[PDB]
Design an enzyme around this catalytic site. Structure first.
Site, mmCIF file in Angstrom:
data_model
loop_
_atom_site.group_PDB
_atom_site.id
_atom_site.type_symbol
_atom_site.label_atom_id
_atom_site.label_comp_id
_atom_site.label_asym_id
_atom_site.label_seq_id
_atom_site.Cartn_x
_atom_site.Cartn_y
_atom_site.Cartn_z
ATOM 1 N N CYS A 1 1.074 -1.522 0.146
ATOM 2 C CA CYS A 1 -0.120 -0.173 -0.025
ATOM 3 C C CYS A 1 0.891 1.361 -0.004
ATOM 4 C CB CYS A 1 -0.894 -0.089 1.229
ATOM 5 S SG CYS A 1 -1.984 -1.708 1.155
ATOM 6 N N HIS B 1 -3.831 7.937 6.139
ATOM 7 C CA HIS B 1 -4.020 6.814 5.448
ATOM 8 C C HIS B 1 -5.615 6.506 5.266
ATOM 9 C CE1 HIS B 1 -2.087 3.614 3.402
ATOM 10 N NE2 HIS B 1 -2.523 2.602 3.795
ATOM 11 N N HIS C 1 -8.906 2.624 -2.129
ATOM 12 C CA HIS C 1 -7.736 2.508 -1.559
ATOM 13 C C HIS C 1 -6.788 1.845 -2.621
ATOM 14 C CE1 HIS C 1 -4.244 0.834 0.360
ATOM 15 N NE2 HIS C 1 -4.464 0.977 1.587
#
Ligand SMILES: NC(=O)c1ccc[n+]([C@@H]2O[C@H](COP(=O)([O-])OP(=O)(O)OC[C@H]3O[C@@H](n4cnc5c(N)ncnc54)[C@H](OP(=O)(O)O)[C@@H]3O)[C@@H](O)[C@H]2O)c1
Ligand SMILES: NC(=O)c1ccc[n+]([C@@H]2O[C@H](COP(=O)([O-])OP(=O)(O)OC[C@H]3O[C@@H](n4cnc5c(N)ncnc54)[C@H](OP(=O)(O)O)[C@@H]3O)[C@@H](O)[C@H]2O)c1
Ligand SMILES: NC(=O)c1ccc[n+]([C@@H]2O[C@H](COP(=O)([O-])OP(=O)(O)OC[C@H]3O[C@@H](n4cnc5c(N)ncnc54)[C@H](OP(=O)(O)O)[C@@H]3O)[C@@H](O)[C@H]2O)c1
Lengths: 279, 1243, 70, 69
Positions: free
Chosen positions: A91, A223, A261
């Site tokens: 990520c 995040h 995401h």
């Protein structure tokens, strides 16, 4: 040779041209620099796709799908003779690419950088795995912060920013004050578990005594995945590092709640939300 | 702009490891490796190759084996292809192949889930190369003689049939005449090679029609022996020997050995983007008066609007704007002529029948180039913008600037929807002189004046005169006030005090003489409508006069000299002698040949048609009448000056008054396409067969008659050797034979007929107590029953029998017969009502006797009241699961009587283990006896003869239709709404007191040319591409005596075989080297043909070409071209009259090159136009005469042998696939007119 | 025919029109092997045959078979 | 949820399960032909027929009536 090109790489070749010219430069003025390219890529789904039919599938797919080609073939076309590199940290990636890049300019090595974030969803298996780990939201949303958080909602994105030394930039969205990365040690609660007690540390290394003032922060872009575990662990460590300071210190947000995401693209795709809103 | 390959959701592993399944995605677009496939073009679609599926499947097998294709010699078994796959011009199709590695089975699915091909494949362990021998019958010392078939020759015969194979698939190099031997070319593609072998199979001598593969019994490929069996021509190419052994049903080539490769019939699907333009070529005068008067519709209106409106002096305007003014009974009067004012293109007001095209035409060849700027004033109400873009788009050589100009922007508003597709420049215009830049000078100007009349006479014309271009044309149309309606238009819509504003013929005459015009044409209607063509003349120069009467062709070097004359504006060609001087055709060639383009090449022709018609002299009064008119085309028939024009044909399928007709379907599967075709006995009844005639009172349908008129069953599974798979319906009838007797009989087909030819071994005398109705229901039904139960199933009394469908025809009979010898019957039946009829009709039936038929429940039922023993014979006529279930009712020693044909036809599986019950299974086809009337048939007849006299056999319930509702008689039978028979009646029977009648049957029957088998037919050039087809088609329509003419004789294999075969079919064929251009030669020929039988047919197909533009033409390139056509035609005309008292057909092929012209065929043109005269003479004399102006002719013309495809655009046209030519010629032959055109449109 | 699998099938194909198959064999029969029904368009009739089915069932038919012997 | 229909099913050898160890049966389906087959580890044929979803499941087919007390 183009129908055997990972659609990431295709639209990377474009977004990074679109980005170099975005900031008043003629890409050609770079031809032959000591300019580098740093790509954050996690998934190259397209590569397997064109690598199953052993009579059908051709040999120059790999010059258009092998991961390194995500950066290499971007260097190849613009004539960027400095570092060409793809990193996979999951990520983060693109943001740690944009870090790795900043450092390389800062330090003399280069005069400019292409920082890219890539992630395209093709194979349903991938997602299925992510669900069998319960980090996916059946909901199908990235409720950031909110108590109604199950998991995140995977999204794609090709994104690129161009870094440059000021004495060479015709436009300035922002300036990079600092960056660094660390890595959650051996947490007793598994590898997926986001260790806040370690993210705090990272946030410190960069501020107070060896960085800017925690008091200058107006906005921290989290995040903000939407994990019932991830969200608290992070936001907690955040305040536990940036908050001996009055006024509503940092307004907080997360593009990831707007769009999903983008995994390795997250960092840079996030930065873009930030720069955009600044302008 | 361009979009690219995005790996697809299903592209990624979604099951697991699977050595046994493969999806192939085929792309056919010009870029793909798999473009080769586009050459497998069958009937015009691109079917993926029958062969193709085996290649995939094969491939798929070596996958599973980890081995490549060249190491896995394969064996197929029982392969079966179910549908073929149509490849779309663009896009991707997917075929999935699945393998069953233990069962050796295999299957081919498609994207949509459908079944495509199924069989068994496996590695072939002991590949025995001796299975591929190529050893002959002996040592042929026949190279240099022989007669083989050339690759071209081969695909000529295939593409004829429907196989439009393309280059990458034309792999047959050479072939034995019979197609048992030959040489196939290697491609490094199994899909091709394999499908070429299929070619050779399909390629029998004298086998017609379109055949796809359907079953193989055993294919066996061994790529090792294959590499070996191959060789290399000098060409540097690669090929191997193919061999076909039809007695063993095996094709071998290289390393691929077929066995039992059964192919089968397919329906040709008429693509109606290739319907031919049929035109008649009548002569048309410029001076036409009293026109029309042939419409019952237009005369039921000069009295329905001169009857309500004559009291003041339904559908359309003058009927609706005159009647809705007497309904309210001047201000709202212009408010009841406007909800119906665009109801104004009314049949009467508007004269769109033939006249309009006759003059637009005249105008159109009177410009050098086939491009024409047209303009139309008063366009809104007088909508010529609807018709002339259509009349013109008709010709193959056109280019149109249409411009619709109207006073307001208003009137061109409903036209925005209509003008956008005809492509018409618009603008604004009021007849007051000012000709804008938005007109820039035209060629023709058209104007409907049965309109909001312009208001001004010579001021409207002063504009129309100021938009000419050198000497263009003006078409205008006013209603004349010298009629009962002409003054009745003026009063109505224009309330104006001078609403009577529509002058008479003399008054318009000098309104044109003012602008310097000349009435080019005049079409006076009976009701008062008149059409005016007008051309205004710019001075003439030096008018050269060359007569073209000679036979020499000297004038040729004289017209080749008049190409040195600068702007020789008037150059006039004119025959004075020969009434057969085809100048009209000549002109059409030069008139657009570069040299004479603007030459204003004109013509003058003397074509008097009867003897008392003198009236043709130059230098004097008329020569200058015609020079003044200036018109390009000037002809003269017995009094009138008019050119030769093209008109549309009267369309209607020519019918005829007969005492004979049989009903056929015109389109397999569409019951509307049923009509009464002419019976071939209506053409000749030759003593021979005549003592067998029989007039039909009742014909009856049977099921087969339906399943065919539908298409569930292929004309394949019909026993018998068939000349024509065409006519095939009806087999039962009842009437009086030529004796006068009273008979009921069967007939192998063509039974649905007013008359029939009595099969003597299968015709019976119908008893005195049976009406003709009741008799007409019996024959098939019972025979099929007796044959099934008695002869074949050897039914003995007191057995049990399961008869399915007891209501049915065969059913009722089955029962009657089983009940007579007293059996336990068990019947199935769908209706609760059928339970009724049956229970009634046979009293000896219990309620235990009945079970259902739309379902499998009948098995359980038979197994109950049978104590699990079952039935002794079953008479199954049911399908799939029901047939299987019918099998299970068999008791020990029982017998299955399979009357049905569906399960049979599809090679469905039968569980062999049923044969342990010492059961015997009977396939049954009564059509296999019948015609072939053997011993067995006799046995089945006397079972009828007897059963009749013992009262066992009785007539069924007759649901009888009139000879009109033949159609419904079919649909009624379709939907199983019948009990007993369905019978179509033709003759009300003759009543009480014993009548010996003699019927007066008049019947409405479509014409279909047939040949009496005693007459002989003559085609010159009969070995030429087309002739060979005309011959073929002739034999089919009956001919037995052909005379084929050619200067050399049989020189091609493809001829050698067509003629060789026709002789084997019993046809008497005679190849003659007699040339018809010499009278002595002609007589030789006709006399030749007469020894075969009186001459009934003469078709002149001979022709030598001499292509060369007019400056290359010599006076003997010209004489050579006309010797076969003009000189040949003329001699055959004479000889034919002198002594051919039984001639019915005199036909001559012309070309459109005579019609619109072709640059470089000025000679071809003449010669051909010449014949069209001679044919017109004959028609006028009441003799058969027909010249056809063909367009490009496909499948075999001079075209396919010279240039290339059926895709070649020639003369602005397309190749008429011969098939279509034949069916056109068929129409033409039964026509009045002397000259008829036929061509396809290009783009 | 008294032969097996592929040979039986091939024996079927030797049938002419109106022909009759006499299946004396029992293997292909016993395993319920498939029979190509399309063979029955040749107006062929297929005979399963078991002499043991008469043998002690000594009926009329058996007598007929005996006097063919006698 | 998949009421099924078999047809012409045929079992060829049966399979002997050993006291210990693992045996594998593979089942293959032909979705258009409705056919089906069962192989074993060793490649042998075990069972073959036709299966498919049963569209109109007629429960009246499971009648245990009978008018013989
Ligand atoms: N092999 C030969 O030589 C030969 C000779 C003659 C006839 N045949 C065949 O034998 C069959 C019977 O002929 P036929 O003329 O005696 O009978 P038919 O009166 O013409 O009609 C056929 C029967 O099939 C039954 N049927 C079931 N479903 C039907 C449907 N959907 N549409 C129409 N009928 C349906 C009908 O009875 P239910 O409604 O009561 O079920 C009807 O009575 C035909 O199929 C024909 O092909 C064979
Ligand atoms: N094909 C087209 O596109 C097309 C278009 C319009 C009209 N047509 C009509 O088609 C006809 C023939 O053309 P096609 O292509 O079908 O066939 P073709 O093969 O070109 O027919 C010509 C044949 O006629 C024979 N022949 C020539 N002069 C003869 C003579 N004086 N006496 C006896 N036989 C003679 C020649 O036979 P030998 O071998 O002995 O020399 C020659 O091969 C023409 O009459 C024409 O009107 C064709
Ligand atoms: N259904 C009935 O009512 C009935 C009654 C009696 C007999 N049968 C059958 O009729 C057949 C012949 O019986 P039969 O009494 O006449 O027996 P047989 O002829 O004395 O011997 C059997 C024949 O089978 C042939 N055969 C083919 N392959 C063979 C092989 N691999 N091994 C041994 N022989 C082979 C042999 O002839 P080749 O060497 O020429 O190949 C041999 O002559 C038997 O198969 C039996 O099942 C049926």
């Amino acid at each position: 040779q183009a129908n055997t090109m990972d659609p990431q790489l295709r639209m990377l070749l474009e977004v990074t041209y679109e980005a170099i010219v975005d900031g008043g430069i003629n890409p050609a003025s770079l031809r032959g620099t000591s300019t580098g390219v740093w790509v954050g890529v996690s998934s190259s789904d397209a590569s397997e796709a064109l690598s199953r039919d052993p009579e059908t599938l051709v040999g120059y797919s790999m010059i258009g799908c092998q991961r390194a080609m995500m950066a290499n073939r971007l260097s190849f076309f613009f004539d960027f003779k400095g570092p060409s590199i793809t990193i996979d940290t999951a990520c983060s990636s693109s943001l740690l690419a944009l870090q790795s890049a900043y450092q390389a300019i800062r330090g003399g090595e280069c005069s400019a950088a292409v920082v890219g974030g890539l992630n395209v969803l093709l194979k349903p298996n991938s997602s299925l795995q992510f669900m069998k780990l319960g980090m996916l939201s059946q909901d199908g949303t990235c409720r950031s912060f909110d108590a109604e958080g199950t998991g995140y909602c995977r999204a794609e994105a090709v994104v690129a920013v161009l870094l440059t030394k000021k004495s060479l930039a015709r436009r300035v969205y922002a300036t990079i004050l600092n960056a660094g990365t660390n890595t959650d040690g051996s947490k007793e609660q598994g590898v997926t578990f986001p260790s806040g007690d370690v993210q705090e540390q990272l946030i410190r290394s960069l501020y107070a005594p060896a960085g800017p003032d925690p008091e200058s922060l107006e906005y921290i872009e989290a995040h903000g995945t939407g994990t019932k575990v991830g969200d608290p662990q992070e936001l907690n460590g955040i305040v536990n590092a940036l908050c001996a300071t009055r006024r509503e210190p940092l307004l907080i947000g997360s593009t990831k709640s707007n769009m999903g995401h983008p995994e390795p693209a997250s960092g840079v795709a996030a930065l873009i939300k930030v720069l955009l809103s600044l302008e | 702009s361009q979009a690219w390959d995005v790996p697809s959701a299903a592209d990624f592993p979604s099951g697991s490891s699977c050595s046994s399944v493969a999806v192939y995605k085929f792309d056919v677009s010009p870029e793909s490796p798999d473009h080769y496939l586009v050459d497998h073009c069958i009937d015009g679609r691109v079917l993926f190759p029958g062969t193709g599926y085996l290649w995939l499947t094969w491939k798929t097998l070596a996958r599973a084996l980890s081995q490549n294709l060249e190491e896995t010699p394969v064996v197929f078994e029982d392969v079966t292809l179910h549908q073929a796959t149509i490849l779309p011009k663009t896009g991707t199709v997917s075929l999935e192949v699945r393998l069953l590695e233990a069962s050796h089975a295999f299957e081919v699915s498609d994207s949509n889930g459908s079944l495509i091909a199924s069989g068994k494949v496996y590695q072939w362990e002991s590949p025995d190369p001796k299975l591929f021998d190529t050893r002959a019958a002996v040592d042929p010392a026949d190279s240099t003689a022989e007669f083989r078939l050339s690759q071209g020759d081969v695909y000529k015969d295939l593409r004829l049939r429907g196989y439009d194979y393309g280059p990458f698939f034309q792999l047959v190099l050479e072939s034995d005449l019979e197609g048992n031997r030959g040489r196939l070319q290697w491609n490094d593609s199994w899909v091709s090679f394999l499908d070429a072998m299929l070619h050779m199979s399909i390629l029998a001598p004298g086998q017609l029609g379109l055949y796809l593969p359907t079953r193989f019994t055993s294919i066996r490929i061994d790529p090792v022996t294959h590499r070996q069996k191959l060789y290399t021509l000098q060409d540097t190419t690669q090929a191997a020997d193919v061999v076909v052994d039809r007695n063993l049903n095996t094709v071998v080539a290289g390393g691929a050995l077929f066995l039992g490769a059964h192919s089968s019939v397919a329906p040709r699907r008429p693509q109606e983007h290739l319907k031919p333009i049929l035109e008649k070529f009548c002569f048309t005068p410029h001076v036409e008066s009293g026109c029309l008067a042939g419409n019952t519709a237009l005369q039921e209106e000069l009295q329905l609007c001169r009857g309500l409106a004559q009291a003041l002096q339904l559908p359309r305007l003058l009927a609706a704007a005159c009647q809705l003014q007497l309904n309210g009974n001047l201000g709202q009067v212009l408010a009841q002529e406007r909800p119906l004012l665009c109801d104004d293109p009314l049949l009467s007001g508007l004269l769109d029948a033939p006249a309009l095209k006759a003059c637009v035409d005249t105008a159109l060849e009177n410009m050098a180039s086939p491009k024409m700027k047209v303009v139309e004033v008063l366009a809104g109400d007088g909508q010529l913008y609807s018709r002339i873009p259509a009349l013109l788009n008709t010709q193959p050589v056109m280019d149109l600037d249409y411009t619709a100009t109207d006073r307001n922007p208003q009137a061109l508003e409903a036209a925005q929807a209509k003008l956008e597709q005809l492509h018409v420049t618009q603008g604004q215009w009021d007849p007051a002189n000012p000709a804008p830049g938005s007109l820039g000078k035209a060629d023709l100007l058209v104007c409907n004046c049965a309109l909001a009349t312009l208001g001004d006479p010579a001021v409207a014309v002063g504009n129309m005169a100021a938009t000419l271009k050198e000497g263009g044309f003006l078409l205008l149309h006013t209603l004349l006030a010298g009629h009962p309606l002409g003054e009745m238009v003026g009063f109505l819509t224009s309330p104006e005090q001078g609403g009577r504003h529509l002058l008479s013929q003399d008054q318009w005459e000098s309104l044109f003489a003012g602008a310097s015009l000349h009435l080019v044409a005049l079409k006076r209607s009976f009701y008062g409508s008149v059409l005016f063509l007008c051309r205004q003349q710019t001075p003439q120069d030096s008018p050269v006069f060359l007569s073209v009467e000679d036979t020499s062709f000297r004038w040729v070097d004289s017209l080749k000299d008049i190409l040195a004359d600068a702007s020789s504006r008037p150059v006039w060609l004119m025959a004075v002698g020969c009434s057969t001087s085809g100048v009209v055709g000549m002109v059409n060639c030069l008139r657009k040949e570069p040299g004479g383009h603007r030459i204003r090449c004109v013509l003058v022709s003397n074509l008097s048609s009867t003897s008392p018609a003198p009236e043709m002299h130059p230098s004097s009064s008329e020569l200058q009448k015609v020079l003044q008119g200036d018109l390009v085309m000037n002809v003269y028939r017995d009094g009138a000056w008019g050119a030769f024009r093209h008109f549309p044909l009267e369309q209607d399928r020519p019918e005829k008054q007969t005492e004979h007709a049989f009903v056929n379907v015109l389109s397999r599967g569409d019951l509307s396409s049923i009509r009464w075709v002419c019976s071939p006995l209506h053409y000749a009844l030759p003593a021979s067969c005549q003592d067998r005639l029989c007039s039909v009172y009742y014909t009856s349908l049977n099921f087969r008659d339906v399943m065919l008129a539908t298409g569930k069953l292929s004309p394949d599974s019909i026993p018998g050797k068939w000349l024509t798979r065409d006519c095939m319906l009806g087999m039962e009838f009842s009437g009086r034979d030529a004796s006068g007797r009273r008979v009921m009989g069967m007939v192998p087909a063509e039974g649905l007929a007013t008359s029939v030819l009595l099969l003597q071994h299968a015709t019976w005398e119908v008893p005195s107590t049976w009406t003709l109705e009741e008799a007409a229901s019996v024959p098939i039904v019972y025979t099929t029953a007796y044959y099934s139960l008695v002869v074949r199933g050897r039914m003995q009394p007191g057995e049990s029998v399961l008869i399915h469908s007891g209501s049915g025809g065969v059913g009722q009979a089955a029962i009657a017969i089983a009940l007579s010898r007293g059996c336990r019957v068990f019947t199935t039946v769908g209706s609760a009502e059928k339970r009724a009829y049956l229970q009634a009709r046979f009293p000896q039936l219990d309620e235990t006797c009945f079970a259902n038929s739309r379902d499998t429940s009948f098995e359980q039922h038979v197994l109950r009241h049978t104590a699990g023993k079952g039935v002794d014979l079953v008479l199954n006529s049911l399908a799939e699961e029901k047939l299987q279930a019918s099998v299970r009712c068999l008791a020990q020693h029982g017998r299955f009587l399979e009357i049905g044909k569906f399960d049979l036809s599809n090679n469905h599986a039968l569980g062999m283990a049923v044969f342990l019950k010492n059961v015997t299974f009977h396939g049954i086809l009564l059509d296999s006896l019948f015609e072939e009337g053997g011993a067995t048939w006799q046995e089945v007849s006397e079972l009828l003869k007897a059963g009749i006299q013992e009262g066992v056999v009785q007539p069924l319930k007759c649901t009888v239709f009139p000879r009109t509702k033949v159609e419904a008689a079919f649909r009624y039978m379709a939907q199983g709404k019948h009990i007993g028979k369905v019978v179509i009646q033709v003759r009300e029977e003759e009543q009480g007191p014993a009548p010996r009648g003699l019927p007066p049957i008049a019947l409405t029957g479509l014409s279909k040319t047939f040949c009496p088998p005693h007459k002989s037919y003559v085609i010159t050039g009969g070995l030429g591409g087309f002739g060979l087809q005309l011959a073929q088609w002739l034999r089919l329509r009956g001919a037995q005596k052909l005379v084929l003419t050619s200067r050399s004789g049989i020189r091609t294999g493809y001829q050698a075989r067509q003629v060789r075969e026709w002789r084997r079919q019993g046809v008497q064929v005679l190849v003659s080297t007699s040339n018809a251009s010499s009278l002595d030669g002609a007589r030789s020929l006709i006399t030749e043909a007469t020894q075969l039988g009186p001459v009934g047919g003469v078709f002149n197909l001979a022709m030598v070409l001499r292509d060369a533009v007019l400056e290359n033409q010599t006076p003997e390139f010209f004489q050579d071209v006309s010797k076969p056509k003009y000189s040949g035609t003329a001699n055959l005309d004479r000889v034919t009259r002198e002594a051919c008292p039984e001639l019915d057909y005199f036909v001559i092929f012309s070309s459109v090159s005579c019609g619109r012209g072709n640059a470089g065929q000025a000679n071809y043109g003449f010669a051909n136009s010449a014949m069209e005269r001679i044919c017109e003479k004959r028609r006028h004399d009441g003799l058969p005469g027909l010249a056809v102006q063909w367009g490009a002719i496909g499948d075999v013309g001079v075209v396919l042998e010279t240039m290339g495809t059926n895709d070649t655009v020639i003369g602005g046209t397309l190749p008429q696939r011969i098939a279509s030519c034949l069916e056109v010629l068929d129409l033409f032959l039964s026509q009045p007119h002397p000259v008829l055109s036929s061509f396809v449109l290009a783009e």
